[model samples]
Target: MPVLENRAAQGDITAPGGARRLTGDQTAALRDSLSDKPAKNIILLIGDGMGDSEITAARNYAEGAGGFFKGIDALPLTGQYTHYALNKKTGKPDYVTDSAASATAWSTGVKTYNGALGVDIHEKDHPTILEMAKAAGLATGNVSTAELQDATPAALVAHVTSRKCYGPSATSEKCPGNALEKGGKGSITEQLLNARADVTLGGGAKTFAETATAGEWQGKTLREQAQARGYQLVSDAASLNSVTEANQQKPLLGLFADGNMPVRWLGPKATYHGNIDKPAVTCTPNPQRNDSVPTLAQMTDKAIELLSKNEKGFFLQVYGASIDKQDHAANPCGQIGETVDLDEAVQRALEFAKKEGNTLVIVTADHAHASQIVAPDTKAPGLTQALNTKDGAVMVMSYGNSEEDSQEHTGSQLRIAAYGPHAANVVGLTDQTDLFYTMKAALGLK
Candidate 1:
């Protein structure tokens, strides 16, 4: 299997028009990476619901008639495998893997049964890459378009036996009696703020709201606590943009959308998920709702700015939440759209690495969702050669594969889209069990 390598410290060694391999300090000891330095900083962008087919389909969607991702169509290539597995409480095989188990693979570098976070197969906590970074005296942060406490994001810090430790209502989504040891009042999102995370960005206002949030969140929200801790908390992009680089603040929190942030483009409607309750709005934007949120690129740029200030380097996780949710929803168009949004974020991170130097950003999906690239409603050559068709009267050939995502995590070959320092190493025949060692080697953690 061929993998693309980002020419980090040296030069652009990727496949001409493809992703770039970034270089760094030359002493960071980036393992299995071309760079001499282990990436001083690694930006891991997690695309939800993006499997191999999903990624290829996304590339074609961005290309439209030509077939390729607009800005990310090329670069160094890297391939990764997902040996998604699940061992039930009774210690049996669930066959296909779930988000929890999949997340643990990359985050903790261990393969536990499905529905698990940063813990070992025995359900014990272990230091994650982020934890390793923290112990190394580096500042850390996590950003996601979805609930900050979601599986992929949470696995960066928290530990639990269930992926849904804080899903809807902050309750256990698994079978009954699977609750958080009865009255476990906090989720990873809640813990991350107090963990002194340098930069925290994402949707999931419910987790940070004042007096809202179903029956969970207890009496306080993560937002209020973060605010109380001297961190600046802002909603929407306008104000967020106002906090420019001149400020020089050490820590800041940005929560753009209400829940999982909306995809960049959802037709003219362009609304995030929080405002789809009305039937009048067939499209997205309704003037009444502030549909368009800050682009993932903008968030990535802002996060890097804040995290980079920490003298010792930082840990940042930018999550493309809607992708997985869309995958779960089994909407192909959504899978493609969310994956594209993530590509934009990846583009931003790669550019930043090029400019700053000595930074490492790993772009990969946490797990793959069964996102099928099926035939669309248009008369194009299937999804591989289609274009966007989003008009009322007459639409172009359906350029996008808006097929819904899979209900469960299925299959072995997952999609791995990466960029930045040592991104090429992520690609190729990789299994979930190889995570801990890969990251440990990547970070040079003892």
Candidate 2:
């Protein structure tokens, strides 16, 4: 990285695709801010694919059933954020952004293409915020209800040309084309081993269990590789519970399922009421997983407890992933269940922030889903039906705009609510990429 002589003479230094890059002065300022007094801890809770509409629906469902508002809705500071990505061909900002690009924006502070992760449009690697946090002596954690190796969580530390490359090299367009040969990086699982974040909890056991690692893992597995690096592997909720205060000081790796975990309301019978036309029905949780998987709130509590031991501070990202997954499936009940779970997770963070007082807690979404309440009339009380099938009740609610229609990511701005130490700065509209700088400063990442 040679210094530019006469930066002004280097005309049109914009990214090749017209995506914004940090100006020299702006970069310098970002670096300077890193040395400021940092919050002792920073927790980012992402309700993936959640937006005003989804939140509004969640609120309506909760309130109509005589429940309180979602905990995040009470956060003192809130703002909307722009989350578009740069289009590779058109060289313009693509209004609809995907998880990979949006996560990259927060992880690396760069606007890249839809499928890229922790890399810019030119397919160059950039250190992610989580990596920076580790370098700054802060313990780091990544928790998601999705596959642990999925785009949102992977972007925290992995840099690859394609988000699909989680592997022992795949043979498809999903794999990074020539990235590994062109100064790019290896699989996300390999990067996770390299990063060795303080705590990693979520699903996706199959990938890491199959992924190969160097040294002793030549015949062993990536999970073995993780253990070799001092990570305590946990499998079930009870095993996660077995993580004591003493053991939590060491890095913990939890893989609860071979795939993504089940949604939060995974009892024998789980029901929601919001509409007057439909009848209640019993449903089961997703496959290959039991009802024993820990909730998002449980994992987050463990993460905060584990990371809090690092006297230097910590950065934790908790993903409310099922909200996005259920929306994509047009499972209305599943979406609201995840949304409610996210609210519980928010309460956990807020409780931690309240007690710790030095933590900066941020609640936001990567992007908005094409979902909203179709016709919500709380005044009617809707048609509520008790679930004799289980200990709960079920009710029909408003339809998601994308339920059976154009289900996709939207260009609309999403909500960002912040609380605790630097919460005041988050009010007013902001760029999604700004979260990188803001969090870097909040955590004193220099």
Candidate 3:
């Protein structure tokens, strides 16, 4: 797998049409790309807050102007989708959306409030795509760079009134009605144990330390409950690699970090007039991220290897989560590196789909973030940073949603691309909720 290879186009840019991706007629290629057959497997890869601007910035910095990402930019069918959430009070449209509601839209086929997960604005719980897939006897997996209880991953297995309710403590204090003692589904972590996906990998080992306030495992740590429930727990890359099989009898649960995983790259933080004050620099490897923690691509590769064992197919979701977090902090290098990380995961999925010929691979983002590619010397009101790109040019990125605090999500349609069976459904405008039905129909799930 050439995960880090820069696949620049080999052509003379000075020629009339040398830079084109398709030199001859593509009518036959377009016809070959369309498929009406049902997909045996579905792999959904999400880059949180990776809008058009974010993708463009990462491509320019890492792949050069005429280069393309072998993973992200290789999808055959592409389209735009609306991701607006509903206001709980007025039941009106909320222009901008958060991770929780945006994820819930595709996971459950419903538009919810900003902080809601697996529930609608009326607080009614709904079945998720992962749960349905599991019920239909398909292998299921959830992988992410963020905490397992974070909004994106939690939406697939847990239902809560607030995204903050990660463990028993937070559930009891913030959402008493949803607490385990109150007869609800418990916290996100607790529900995750009940959801019982075949493979679950990500961070948030800290929440597993909290004891269950009520249930058969009362007073026992969530980690202990997982052991009692036959979960094969692994905390590092070495331990994760040792696992050979994952099934209902022994599900895999790998938690590599206490919180969100450390980012891959480090560089200067965006500041007021930083583009003019500081020299353009390159990103460096993060010393905090080492062999113990597996990269997103590694996790995705392992997940596919395990899930593909079942004769019946599988449904897996791979998330590259810190792009939003880094973008909120106005760190250009951090955000760009995460995007590149997700592209590699996409590469793994595409490779599998191409070989299997019956798998559907979809790559998209949860919401639009605040990052813009501006002129090199233009000063911005909020924050700015400059970097030397692979094209040997200086690129300036600005985050103006906020002056000092975390930046805000933008109300913009996001790019959604797909390949393999049933991929033509993503060729035109659609709502985020449509994705749930698309995957469900493709898998023939009840």
Candidate 4:
């Protein structure tokens, strides 16, 4: 990398896009002060299993130091150190805060006992953000790479006892060993089922079908309710693409792929590094062993197309579960790789935001996942000569190959990053409940 000795030829240079914008990374802490918009419309992105350490590990591996922030990095705002669930301070095992509780935090800005949704520990409370959004005038939607009934997305559209909206045998604890303790048929999906969400895309075939026999969900079904209310249901890539972008007389629901979608691989290299005309990578299936799935970018692009059709403005969500899975295993590469995927999606979102200048697009993670990052050595390419964990002085963690806990959480704090309108209000340390309020307040629902 060459250093910039001097800049500007006496006059500002015209950018490739033809707009005369700031030349380099611009920073001004003492600029504008925009108050949080009370009636703003929004699109909040949540990475369910993301922790602070997970994010740093991702940055190091994927775009270390000078690396890119996978999909979400383009927004490049900052983040927050969040706390939720009344039981513990930062969160722990057994009762470590799950997506359900986090979702509760996002949906209502209130902390609940673990395994619960928009409802409190008692399992009865006010409507979810989705419900309230519907109650208001804006269109609402829920999208994810996980099953439509998964915890994070469910928090937006449901109110339930446990995060396991699916029901019995959700796990043995949810059931009985010799018999079954038997979990209940729970789903906020039921909320989505009845609401006039402008657009909804996701999976959970059984849940949407008249019979969802697997897991803990036993209910009136996802499809029957949406269809009964006159929603146009389409499950396929082509059909979703065909869903017109015009504000419709009715809502649209799209569920692409089987379980989670595919990923967008790093595109083939340009014929030459300087060749401006390079074809972007496309989505490939994960039929074989390795991880291959549609990237969040594709889903986000499709969502914007569909939601924008509604003049009243629409709400949408897209998630990357690959990172979540990696967080649990404490796999550094997977966590960061997913962030890269998430960054691609962020690119799509930024494009959309630019077009709809008034749109409030929130690029965020549900929680900070821990997968500490160590600086790579300037002397070498990967981690071989990188800053050792013993040099913890820089706040980066060093690990040993012989270590049992390959990656784990520590007292070193996590932070939240953001941009877009009203984002400044979420800065500094806050609870998941503040997340709940900011999302609503930014969009003016509060």
Candidate achieving the largest TM-score: 3
Q: Model 1, residue 314: what's the lDDT?
A: 71
On a 0 to 100 scale, what is the lDDT of residue 70 in model 2?
43
lDDT of 4 by residue, 30-106 (tens): 13323354434567777756666566555544443333453455443455656545553343322346667767777
- TM-score, cand. 3 vs. native: 0.97
Residues 275-386 of candidate 2 have per-residue lDDT tens digits of 4334444444456446578889999988888888878888899999988877665565577679888988988888887677788888999998855543333323222222
Q: Point out the higher-scoring one by TM-score: 3 or 4.
A: 3
Ranking by TM-score: 3, 2, 1, 4
Q: Is candidate 1 or candidate 2 better by TM-score?
A: 2
Which pairs clash in the backbone of model 2? 272-395, 273-395, 274-396, 274-397, 275-396, 275-397
Q: Which is better, 1 or 4, measured by lDDT?
A: 1
Model 1 scores a TM of: 0.73
Off by over 4 Å in 1: 1-33, 65-67, 70-75, 90-94, 167-185, 210-222, 244-250, 267-292, 374-406, 417-424
Clash pairs of candidate 3? none
The most accurate candidate by lDDT is 3
